Design a protein around this nucleic acid. Structure first.
Lengths: 100, 97, 82, 106, 100, 82, 106, 97
DNA sequence: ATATATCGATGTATATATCTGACACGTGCCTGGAGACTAGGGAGTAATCCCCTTGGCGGTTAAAACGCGGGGGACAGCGCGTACGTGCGTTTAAGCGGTGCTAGAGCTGTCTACGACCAATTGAGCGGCCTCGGCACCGGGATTCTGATATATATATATATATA
DNA sequence: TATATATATATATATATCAGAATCCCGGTGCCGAGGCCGCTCAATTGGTCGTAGACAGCTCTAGCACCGCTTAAACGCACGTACGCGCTGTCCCCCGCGTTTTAACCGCCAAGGGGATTACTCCCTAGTCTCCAGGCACGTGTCAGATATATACATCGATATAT
């Protein structure tokens, strides 16, 4: 017979209910560390970082992106949609004031 | 040969926790978060008391400046609960002198 | 000597962050703008923290500089150091 | 002899807060009742936060407060959310919630 | 003869081009003064107000409402509408963070 | 001795403020919510300004108290006093 | 004899800024070069804003700077608008900026 | 029979205006706005310099603290133009001593 | 049958006097800024060390990348009632201008309680080590949903049947 | 031969049922992070001295409140028309769920070495005090850019008569 295959939307609901209740770091540690060092070498060359500095940057970046995705979701639901699109992100960043 | 004498509110937060919950412990990271919270409340109230001292052409921080800073910063029920708590603590100070 | 490491912020990582934010369907052009927005946010915070490290005449960007750089932008971080 | 925290009936330090008010250059002359009032307000705020955190820990069947319990305690309350709106908690989470549009129709 | 009556939308655009060019306080001074005194007498009975305090409150309230209407209009144009709705105001105040 | 003075914030004045905001059409339910939003904003700013007034042993509210209350909330007002 | 604002070539006062740094209880001691550096930065920011405000006043054929000219000068510029983000200019206005969707279809 | 002295930056702003635009005046409300602007810039840079001196366990606001505070608060080209202006003013001071 | 050029009409900005109230400028003075000497303490310079960061190697392994089938959501289009703009007449209420008055704000003199400061001392707080219990991990059972499916169930139809 | 009623049968749809993954929960083991004890050390406490900032009153003066009247501009309500927001439908495409493959992150261990923290010396840089004197601020007066009134050229918006 055909395999037991879920409808599109059930797995997304399960992932929402799973990732909202666990508190790990969703971005991998090493590529974020490489991204931080790549951005930081533009200002001052030959820098050093503590592990707690990269950890603090990762927690701040994840918290900021999760808040931005919450407001982006509310923008998308406001326009009678369930799919977040980029124009929701420019609307959210415009209302928040980060679009200079 | 220790490194340095680091100052923190860990013992006092643990004493407050053992008055509130006699059988609940606390992890190290939760204590560090709560230490940051206590220091942030301290710097907020102290900066507002400094602003109230400068704004009235005064040069001191009495209890009224901190009471007004608590009234400006803390919202709702927390404001008047903390004002009543601080008032009875200042009264218990002065009566025991 | 490096590469383009913004491609290291993978599509499932943005997917998991968006699940934690609570979204159900994600368009295919979300990921490029999320990488750009994250790059802008890090170029703010890292620049302020590097300035804090410049003033102390140090070379290791410690956790305190990151906490102060985040506090200056109105995103206070309880946790590390304080 | 008697410390000022014990005389005032508190547990946050009065002498340390007096030292941090004097040498944190907020004003020229830090008064006498000011560190006691500030320590009492700070002790009340810590007592409220730890009470809600302990309630969230007991509701989750754990006997040790983790940062998720602090996140749940602060954001499940309303006036602490008004106080701590601009702050993020390291190794915390978000509140478990989802909009009713995203839920599947029955 | 039939009178020369403008289409619905032309006079609105003229008023947008006129009030964005003007400077003066749009709300009448005396009802706003009465509103400020009504709100202020809850906190403390028998208060006095300088004139410059009432004009400062009027300027701040007018600028805040104009900024909120800009964000509300951006929300309305986002949802394929030209008419602002109350849900646009709740979305703008929610993304701004003003929802208590 | 007062009346209900929020109806003095008149529907043409919300209309003119929205024309300055750049709005083409107004729904009929904007006005009640705009009155509520303005009432909430004034109940914040006037409360902070009155607290500044009662601190200084004064019974009148100067322009400086309103400037300090607005500066505390993030709406910094150049102009009056400063 | 020679005032320190005239000695450093500036126009903003160095002595008054030194006094306001001294008894403005920012720190215990204040160095000598700090009021001069601060006065130079303040004078540059003022000179930039007066330059753009004079340009905006000459564009509207007025020989006296009103608050609307300052409002236009601040919000037309990029870095000056980014610096004064939450700042409300009293008796100013808004920029003439109408969205393209609201314009009538031709 | 004057009431009190009011210290303000009005004549200094007028000197800067007449060195920038020799034939353009300024209204009184515009002078009050730029007085508020100059005081707000002074308060921002002074507060950040105080915070910078406190975070390094230092007890003197030197010119380096003002330079770092200017590089922190001012964005973009304004930061580098302001630090070039301040550096040449401090250099003129030291040479003219 | 629909796009196009007139043309009546309405609002906008321009020219010019005027008169005016707000801004530029002269004057005293008194207040804070500047010169000089003291004295002291914060901060830079030099050597140490050890602590933590960076770089490298191996290895299993969880997770990202790619591809494919398809289902559901986004987008476009048509229809339409409704809700809002626009205009008109009227009446209310805000703006303005005096006028009293009186309550509250600012200055001033004084003097009193209160906070800074110094030295000694000791009790509280912090670093380091141990030891133990709460949490992490793994395996099995129950549960709790989700998805596909057979069952029966209401509905349209074509022919049998009754009436004229 | 024409007209009207009923009902078995075929068909598109609501619903109980059964199987399949995912997750919670219970228990056993172990493991590592938190609580408790002990030594050191440093900063809070107490007493006495002294400068000074803030409270009390009292005076005065100024500006905020209440009142009245004229004017006239703006709001309010009614009517009408039209453009737009909502809703339904069709479709088409574009994410999603799932499976296989590969690969790069995680963890752990090791070595080098660069820099952060410490301690001491000194030096130069800043607070304090005095004392003189120039700058800035309040006040009064000239004067000139700007608001308002009347008239007018012109941009422009919509209703319409005409051409292909």
């Amino acid at each position: 017979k055909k395999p037991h295959r879920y409808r599109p939307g059930t797995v997304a609901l399960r992932e929402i209910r799973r990732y909202q209740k666990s508190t790990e770091l969703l971005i991998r540690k090493l590529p974020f560390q490489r991204l931080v060092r790549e951005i930081a070498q533009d200002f001052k060359t030959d820098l050093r970082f503590q592990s707690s500095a990269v950890m603090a940057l990762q927690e701040a970046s994840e918290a900021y992106l999760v808040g931005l995705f919450e407001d982006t979701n509310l923008c998308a639901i406001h326009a009678k949609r369930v799919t977040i699109m980029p124009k929701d992100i420019q609307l959210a960043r415009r209302i928040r004031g980060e679009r200079a | 040969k220790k490194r340095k004498r680091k100052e923190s509110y860990a013992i006092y937060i643990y004493k407050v926790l053992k008055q509130v919950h006699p059988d609940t412990g606390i992890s190290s990271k939760a204590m560090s978060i709560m230490n940051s919270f206590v220091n942030d409340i301290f710097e907020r109230i102290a900066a507002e008391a400094s602003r109230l001292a400068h704004y009235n052409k005064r040069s001191t921080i009495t209890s009224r400046e901190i009471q007004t800073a608590v009234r400006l910063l803390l919202p709702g029920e927390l404001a008047k609960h903390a004002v009543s708590e601080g008032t009875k603590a200042v009264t218990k100070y002065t009566s025991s002198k | 000597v490096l590469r383009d490491n913004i491609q290291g912020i993978t599509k499932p990582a943005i997917r998991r962050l968006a699940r934690r934010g609570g979204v159900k369907r994600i368009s295919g052009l979300i990921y490029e703008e999320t990488r750009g927005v994250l790059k802008v946010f890090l170029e703010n915070v890292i620049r302020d923290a590097v300035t804090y490290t410049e003033h102390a005449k140090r070379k290791t960007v410690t956790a305190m500089d990151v906490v102060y750089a985040l506090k200056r932008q109105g995103r206070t971080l309880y946790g590390f150091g304080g | 002899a008697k410390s000022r925290s014990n005389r005032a009936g508190l547990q946050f330090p009065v002498g340390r807060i007096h030292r941090l008010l004097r040498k944190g250059n907020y004003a020229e002359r830090v008064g006498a009742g000011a560190p006691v009032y500030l320590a009492a307000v700070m002790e009340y705020l810590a007592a409220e936060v730890l009470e809600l955190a302990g309630n969230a820990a007991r509701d989750n069947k754990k006997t040790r407060i983790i940062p998720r319990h602090l996140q749940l305690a602060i954001r499940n309350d309303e006036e602490l959310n008004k106080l701590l709106s601009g702050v993020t908690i390291a190794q915390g989470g978000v509140l478990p919630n989802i909009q009713a549009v995203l839920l599947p129709k029955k």
